[PDB]
Amino acid sequence: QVQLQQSGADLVRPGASVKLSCTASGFDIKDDYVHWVKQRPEQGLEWIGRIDPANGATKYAPKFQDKATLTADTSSNTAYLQLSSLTSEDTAVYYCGRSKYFDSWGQGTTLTVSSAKTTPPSVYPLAPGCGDTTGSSVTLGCLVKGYFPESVTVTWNSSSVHTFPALLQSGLYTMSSSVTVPSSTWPSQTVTCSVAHPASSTTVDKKLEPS
Amino acid sequence: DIVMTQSQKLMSTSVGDRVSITCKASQIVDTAVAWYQQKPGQSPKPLIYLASNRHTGVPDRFTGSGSGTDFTLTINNVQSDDLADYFCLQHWNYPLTFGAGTKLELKGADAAPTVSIFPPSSEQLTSGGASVVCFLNNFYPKDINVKWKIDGSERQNGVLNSWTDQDSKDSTYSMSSTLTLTKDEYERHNSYTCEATHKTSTSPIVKSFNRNE
Amino acid sequence: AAKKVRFYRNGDRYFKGIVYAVSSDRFRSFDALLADLTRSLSDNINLPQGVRYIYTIDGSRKIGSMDELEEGESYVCSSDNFFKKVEYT
Ligand SMILES: [Cl-]
C-alpha cells in the first residue's frame, strides 16, 4: 500500500551526529511532504519539522532549527533527519509521517544518545528479612541494576509476576521484577530468578534465600 | 505555538460504553485537526482528518466532531481493542502541535496495593551500593503516593518510581519504588520505611524494616 | 455569464476544493482572481506564499487567463512552479 520504512535503532555518543532515514513506497515523495516528530514518555509528541522534497523547502519547529536538518532524495524516495551535537534529551523515538495529516506513519526509530559501554547487570535477590511469612502468598523479587544497553529478560524458576520498566540511573539502566509464590513453597522449595542480557552475552541465575 | 489541551489525562471506561475525548485549542484552528490512536510500542494510527472525517479502515464507532477551538473524538460501543492513547493534532499553523494525550483505561473495582519492602542484599552491600526496594502491586485506581522515611525522617532524593501499564486481565496497576543511597549512608541508619497512600484507606499502608533485627 | 470551475490546493490530498464562478463579470482581472484564491485557499502549510500559479488537473499546463478556464473543469493552485501529482478528485 502506502508504506513508510524507517532505519534501525541507533546508539550514538553525545556531541556526535546521526542520520535517520525514512523510505517511502506506494507513492513518490516528490508529490508530497514528509514530516518528522519526536516522542518521549513524558514530553509527548513534539513536531520537528517538514520538507517538500520537490524543491527542498524545509520548515522547522523553533526548538529544532539548530539541532535538526531535513533532507530528501526523490531518486531514492527517501527523507532524512539529521540531528547534530546530540545531548541526552535526544534519546527518543522519532517518526516520519506523510503530510500534515500524518495519514501514514513510519514504524519509528529508537535513538539512544549515551556514552555508556555495554555492561552486564548486577542481579540482587529481594527476600524478606527477619520474620516468618503470613498469609497464603510470599512476594519475592530480583533487582537488576547497572546494565547497558536496554533489553534484559527475567525468568523465574520455582504464581504472579510483575516486570517493572527500566529507568536510567547514573547513566545506566535499572529494572526490577517481582514474583508472588505460595507461602507453602518458599522457602521450603527453591526460587531462582534467571537474568539474560543479550547485548553483553550475560545470563545470571540468583537463588532467593531466607533469613 | 498553539496549545492543544486534552484536560483528561486518564479516562476509565467499560466495554460497550460511549466515551468522549476532548481537545481544546488555545486559538481558533478551523477544522485543521486530526486524531490518532497509539498503543504501547506502536506508531500512531490515524483516525480522523479535517476534524470529522474517518480515515479508511477506521470502524464506524469512531466519530470526530468540532470546529474552531473545541474538538471531540467519540468512541461508541467501546471495545477492549480501543483501550489506548488518543491525541489530537492541529495543523492550522506552524509549528504543528499535538495534545498531551488521553489514556483510555478499563474501569475496575477499587483494590488496595499489596506492599512489600526488601533490604539491600548482602551481595549488593559488598559492592559499595545499597538499594532498598518497595513493591506496590495490584492496586486501583492508578492514583497513589509513596513516601520514604529513614529513621522517621522523610527522604525524597534518590527515589525512582516505575509503573507498569494497566493489567489487561484484572484492571490493576503496579509500581516499584527504589531508594538508592551509598553503602555508607545506608549503614548510618537503622530503620527504613515505605509508606503508601491510596483511595482505599485513610491510613497509609506502612512497610518498614529495621537493620538490627 | 460565468464559468463554474473548482480550485484545489496543490499537494493537499484531503481538501475537496472550492467551486468558483469565473469571468470578467466576476473578477476585474486574472490578478484579482489569484488574490481572492489566495484569501479563500490560504493555509499556512500548503500555500505558504498564496496562489501564484494555476494548473490544470493533471499538471500539463499553467492557466494564464480567465478565458483559458473551461466550464466544469477543475484546477490546482500553487505557491510555486512545482505541481504535486495527487488524487485531487
Ligand atoms: Cl504537509
From TrEMBL, chain A:
Domain Ig-like: 2-96, 121-209
Top-rank lineage group of the source organism: Eukaryota
Disulfide bonds: 22-96, 142-193
Protein name: Ighg protein
Organism: Mus musculus (Mouse)
Residue numbers of the full-length protein present here: 21 to 240 of 476
Automatic annotation (TrEMBL), chain B:
Residue ranges constituting the Ig-like domain according to the UniProt record: 2-87, 113-210
CC per GO annotation: immunoglobulin complex
Superkingdom assignment: Eukaryota
Name listed for the protein in its UniProt record: MAb 6H10 light chain
Disulphide-bridged cysteine pairs: 134-194
Annotated SUPFAM superfamilies: Immunoglobulin
Pfam families registered for this protein in UniProt: C1-set, V-set
Lineage of source species: Eukaryota, Metazoa, Chordata, Craniata, Vertebrata
Listed InterPro entries: Ig-like_dom (IPR007110), Ig-like_dom_sf (IPR036179), Ig-like_fold (IPR013783), Ig/MHC_CS (IPR003006), Ig_C1-set (IPR003597), Ig_sub (IPR003599), Ig_V-set (IPR013106), IgV_Light_Chain (IPR050150)
Organism of origin: Mus musculus
Keywords per UniProt: Adaptive immunity, Disulfide bond, Immunity, Immunoglobulin, Immunoglobulin domain, Signal
A Gene Ontology biological process term: adaptive immune response
